[PDB]
Amino acid sequence: SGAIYVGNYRVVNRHLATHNDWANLVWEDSSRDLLVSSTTAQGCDTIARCDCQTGVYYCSSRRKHYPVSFSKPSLIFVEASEYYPARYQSHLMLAVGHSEPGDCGGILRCQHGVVGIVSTGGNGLVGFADVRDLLWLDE
Ligand SMILES: NC(=O)[C@H]1CCCN(C(=O)Cc2cc(C(F)(F)F)ccc2C(F)(F)F)C1
Numbered sequence: 001s002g003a004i005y006v007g008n009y010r011v012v013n014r015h016l017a018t019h020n021d022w023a024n025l026v027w028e029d030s031s032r033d034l035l036v037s038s039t040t041a042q043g044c045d046t047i048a049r050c051d052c053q054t055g056v057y058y059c060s061s062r063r064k065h066y067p068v069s070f071s072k073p074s075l076i077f078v079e080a081s082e083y084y085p086a087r088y089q090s091h092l093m094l095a096v097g098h099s100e101p102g103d104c105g106g107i108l109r110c111q112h113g114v115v116g117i118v119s120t121g122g123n124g125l126v127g128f129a130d131v132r133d134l135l136w137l138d139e
């Protein structure tokens with residue numbers, strides 16, 4: 001569980017989205033596991049606009065923040081689940097670090113702000129859905 005609150009937008013994992021999220025839908029992409037819905041209250045998360053490859057992510061399964069090195073956003077294959085069939089997820093960044101079911105939604109941050117959210121994991125690895133290319137989140 002977890003979301004990004006920037007201006008009048010809420011950013012969540014698409015597979016974790018609520019009824020409210022779908023009834024107030026702005027944009028969604030299954031191939032990125034992202035969904036953006038509208039909000040009445042104003043959010044103050046700063047989204048990073050950079051090509052950083054080091055940052056810090058929140059791991060709810062350990063109740064701890066962890067520093068990580070992470071790869072450039074790319075098309076990576078992701079095994080089947082009760083939410084999606086086997087497929088390549090786009091805009092995904094990998095890091096060596098702990099994650100287990102229940103960790104999706106944890107924020108990855110760099111010195112410039114929010115980079116993305118936990119979206120995949122397993123085998124001593126963690127995957128993040130990048131949000132830095134979504135320039136419209138700020139306007
Ligand atoms: N983006 C997807 O299609 C996800 C959907 C949920 C499930 N997805 C996973 O990665 C599986 C899983 C979840 C987690 C996460 F929550 F950190 F992701 C950690 C580990 C694992 C593991 F190791 F058991 F396979 C794909």
Ligand SMILES: [Zn+2]
Pocket residue numbers: 048049050051052110111112113
């Ligand atoms: Zn940065």
